[PDB]
Motif scaffolding. Sequence first.
Motif, PDB file in Angstrom:
ATOM      1  N   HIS A 230       7.239  -1.687   5.359  1.00 35.96           N
ATOM      2  CA  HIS A 230       8.652  -2.034   5.482  1.00 35.96           C
ATOM      3  C   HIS A 230       9.337  -0.888   6.220  1.00 35.96           C
ATOM      4  O   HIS A 230       9.883   0.027   5.601  1.00 35.96           O
ATOM      5  CB  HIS A 230       9.276  -2.283   4.111  1.00 35.96           C
TER       6      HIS A 230
ATOM      7  N   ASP B 161      11.548   2.072   4.310  1.00 35.39           N
ATOM      8  CA  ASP B 161      12.746   1.364   4.750  1.00 35.39           C
ATOM      9  C   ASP B 161      13.300   1.951   6.042  1.00 35.39           C
ATOM     10  O   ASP B 161      12.706   1.786   7.113  1.00 35.39           O
ATOM     11  CB  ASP B 161      13.817   1.382   3.655  1.00 35.39           C
TER      12      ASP B 161
ATOM     13  N   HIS C 139      12.053  -0.125   9.514  1.00 34.53           N
ATOM     14  CA  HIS C 139      13.041  -0.692  10.422  1.00 34.53           C
ATOM     15  C   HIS C 139      13.124   0.176  11.670  1.00 34.53           C
ATOM     16  O   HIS C 139      13.384   1.380  11.578  1.00 34.53           O
ATOM     17  CB  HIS C 139      14.406  -0.798   9.744  1.00 34.53           C
TER      18      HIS C 139
ATOM     19  N   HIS D 146      11.695  -5.125  -2.268  1.00 37.13           N
ATOM     20  CA  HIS D 146      12.313  -4.483  -3.423  1.00 37.13           C
ATOM     21  C   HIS D 146      11.961  -5.198  -4.722  1.00 37.13           C
ATOM     22  O   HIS D 146      10.916  -4.925  -5.320  1.00 37.13           O
ATOM     23  CB  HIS D 146      13.828  -4.407  -3.242  1.00 37.13           C
TER      24      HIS D 146
END
Lengths: 581, 590
Positions: free
Chosen positions: B233, B523, B235, B462
């Motif tokens: 995960h 993240d 970005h 999450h």
Amino acid sequence: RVLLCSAGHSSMVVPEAFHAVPEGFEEVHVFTTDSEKFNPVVLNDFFHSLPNVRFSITKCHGLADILNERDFEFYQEMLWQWYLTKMPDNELPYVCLSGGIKSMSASLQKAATLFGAQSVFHVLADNNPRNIEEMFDALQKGQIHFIEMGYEPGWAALRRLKKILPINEGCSRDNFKPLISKSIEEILSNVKIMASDTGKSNQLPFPSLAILPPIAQQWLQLPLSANDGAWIQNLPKVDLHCHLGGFATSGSLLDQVRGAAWPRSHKSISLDKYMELGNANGSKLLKDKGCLIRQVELLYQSLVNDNVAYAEIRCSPNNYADKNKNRSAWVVLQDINDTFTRLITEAKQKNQFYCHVNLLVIASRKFSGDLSDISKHLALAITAMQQGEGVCRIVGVDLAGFENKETRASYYEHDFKAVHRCGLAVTAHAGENDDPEGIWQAVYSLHARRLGHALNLLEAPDLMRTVIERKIGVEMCPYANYQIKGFAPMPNFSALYPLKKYLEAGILVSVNTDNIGISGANLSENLLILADLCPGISRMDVLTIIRNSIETAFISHDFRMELLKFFDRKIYDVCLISIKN
Amino acid sequence: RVLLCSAGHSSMVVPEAFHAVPEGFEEVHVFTTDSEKFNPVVLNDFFHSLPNVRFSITKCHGLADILNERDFEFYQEMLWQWYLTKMPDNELPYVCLSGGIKSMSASLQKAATLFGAQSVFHVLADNNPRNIEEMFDALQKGQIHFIEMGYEPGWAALRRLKKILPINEGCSRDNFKPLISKSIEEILDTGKSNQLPFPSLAILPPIAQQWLQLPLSANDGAWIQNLPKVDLHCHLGGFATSGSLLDQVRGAASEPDLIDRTFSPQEIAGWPRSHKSISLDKYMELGNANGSKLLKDKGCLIRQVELLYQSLVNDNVAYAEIRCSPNNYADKNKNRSAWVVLQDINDTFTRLITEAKQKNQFYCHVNLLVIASRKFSGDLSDISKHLALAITAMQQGEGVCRIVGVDLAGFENKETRASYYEHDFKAVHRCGLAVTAHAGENDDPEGIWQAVYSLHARRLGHALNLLEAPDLMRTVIERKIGVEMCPYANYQIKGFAPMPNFSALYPLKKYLEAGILVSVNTDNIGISGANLSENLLILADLCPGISRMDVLTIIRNSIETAFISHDFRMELLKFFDRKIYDVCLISIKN
Ligand SMILES: Nc1ncnc2c1ncn2[C@@H]1O[C@H](COP(=O)(O)OP(=O)(O)OP(=O)(O)O)[C@@H](O)[C@H]1O
Ligand SMILES: [Mg+2]
Ligand SMILES: [Mg+2]
């Protein structure tokens, strides 16, 4: 608690080491050579003064002392064998080293390091005592001293060598064999191979039985032979697809059940010839209670006989209910669960190897007849899994029955909105005669965690990728398709079993018995047929099949961990035993 | 070579071992207690005849012989220090045990089996010679035996205590910490017993094999950095947000005239270790300096992608999946369509991968995840556009940096529970893509059920509230549904222990015990200000009692839940196995 110490020429170690721990010990064993210098009287009478504790003396036959390489190696082998055969079953023991000359001390320390020990220690006395009263006196004045080395964990893979040879009935030099030397060489070769190469050093794709000797790994990599029947029978196995009602359909099983109130045929048949052949049992016979109980006991005994460690059984409670006798389907299922849990508890109490069994409630595809039967079966399973207490339980439902385009997965999908809600599991039977669209919807509409047969996956690469990525299992029984379709060089049938290609692709394939009775063959025979039926199959793929079977089972996480640990230990032990022969 | 020996009553067992190898020996260093029964002059005369053989003599000062616990432990620590000081830099030393009473022999044998020795062995003579003209004919007649039990590799990497603990030849027992005692005292639950991934971990020596079970501490930063990790995960838009990375990406722009250099996100005390909980709006505003307002430039995008890949390789990551929004970077003025942007990212990553692989260096295979955001301010046709773009990129086919699947994420204020956007997700699975779902960040545990059983999502973003829905946790575990979790981001935007005025506990430990295939990710790297290594290391003070084997099984879970083909998964598993084996062998040599 067990104390192990070496005996040389003087008897200092044993009593002082025995009392060195304030609580005292329970079993104490002492190793010694064939030398006549040592005396066994003092220790014998001292331990007879306290008969509550255990004591024994082991003598290395034919060796008074160490005089050359052969003498030292034989003494080390005998010491290692004695340590291994006096190993406590669960807990690590205590070791005292101060006995014998330095070579015995070093050999004993190496043994403790290799096989693990609770807390090894030293014992030294300044006055060099002689007799019991003044050992006690010196202990009271505090002159006793214990020197603790440490806590050796040892190689967990080395402690499992008790299975190959506890003792060779007093082996002689003519028939002597250095088995513990084989152990040390296998571990050193494994470590050296790890530290030297990179290819074989990184390959290692399996459950950490990699501590096997390199010769064992090479033997495993060899293609599976038809003569490995003994090894495969000794291998613990898993049967995720077995039908209870099809056991006593041939042989003396049917006669025994009635009184307690092939398989290599090359005929290609298409259904109803198992149904009519098995009509002697099931609906017509199991209406009573004694027949059902006898069938359950016979099935459990057969499962335990083949060393099967876990199985899931698909039964038909509504097919066995008798309203006229006030025998509802729920009562029949409760009886099945009760007899299975009683058998499991009985086997477990004996500490003998036992076969955990879970039940799957079938939902027969009767089609037009009694459309409410599907809802009744689903609700019965949903409320039956909630009994909670019991080692055996219901873990899922089944969708087997008459397969047809109208009977596709998009026909009963209205009734399955709650099976997943309540936490159940769904299998399916499709692909034998249906369309890949049906398999696709069964995978995506019913959320079927497993799947039955579907031997024609290869023709649908998209659906093959879908099943592979989603880790959807496949239950495919070699004898079933051998008798139904053309495999195992069947005459006028060039079709080849896709098990090999399924394994290369990565499909979690599980081999099952389907129905033991009508097929007339157990799961071991099912594994053997893969040798000639599928050429070029290696022995490692059999273990891959076992791992996939125990990975695709509808079991809890902790139960899966327990099953994995037991299977790892058993596979290690059986391979280590069988490589010799 | 260097040989080490210790003896008691016997005076010259060292010359007897000096003929163990027919070719000879090069260096001799003898350590013994301060007892007078050992004769140093005889050894000096013996070794003076061979100037080419170095002869160094050391003795246990102040200790004639071992008599009690204190003397024994003092001798043991001095012997250990002398051993790790005197061992050769690249070769295991030679050592013999033909002399010495039980205490020193046992101590030296246990020391040898810990660090290592080229060959430990015993030399015994039938006639126990007293003087050299006797052992000459003892060896000539073959009476002297070269008793050797076997090679002793030991821990092939444990000698870092030579440097991390300074070499101190002159010292006493008053100052010594037996780290080996701590690493040995508690060794022998089903979980740590059989939960070991990476089969080669079983090959490790028992000391390390049990070391992996000790609780994780903040001092293992080097070890945790050295492991190959997996990030799932990540970005792309949140990589560079401030500092040198922002300066570089701004300077790489094609047109620097229209670059807003005035804006600067506000500072938070102790960041990333926030002194208080923060909201999602402020967390996103912290990334306002970057995102889509600056990534429109093609040169800026190329610089950002290259810098992100360089950071990934620096963090020792071996596989990663990048979440990107191709539509957000599209501009019709410059013929910069979303498809062109995605294609350009694909070619840039493929070129970087190929150029890193051709040099036989360390490279992290990277795949892209398209983001089908919640589409604020309406205009939900963009969901269909994103799905079509993802499918087209999927059967583009040829290449290395492929597109794995789609991702659904966005604000929870709209109350989307995988039912509003379900109307279009059906066609994705037919092609063969994969679906994730940012489900239940701060919402009810109902929508997760729809995301799992209707969207067929193979991962859950999450989902920190899963602990209050045991019925949902059961099916999550039973369906093998991965749960991506970001420690630093969730801690910053939600608050967890040990942050004062808070009582909630991070559920990672309970998630692992239950058996959820949890994978730890990062993240937004730039906004949170912490890479994968720091995120993994924060588990020490985030979830107390976590073990190193739990981290390794977390990496294994990340390997398991990643959308990859079977063969590529097998190769990745083999490489991870070998690399992780080498790391646990060499990095914790401390
Ligand atoms: N989940 C399980 N399934 C089957 N057997 C189990 C399971 N759990 C424990 N056992 C039993 O625990 C027992 C432990 O036995 P142990 O480790 O002492 O080896 P053993 O007695 O020498 O040989 P064996 O494993 O055949 O009994 C095994 O017999 C095994 O049958
Ligand atoms: Mg069947
Ligand atoms: Mg995110």
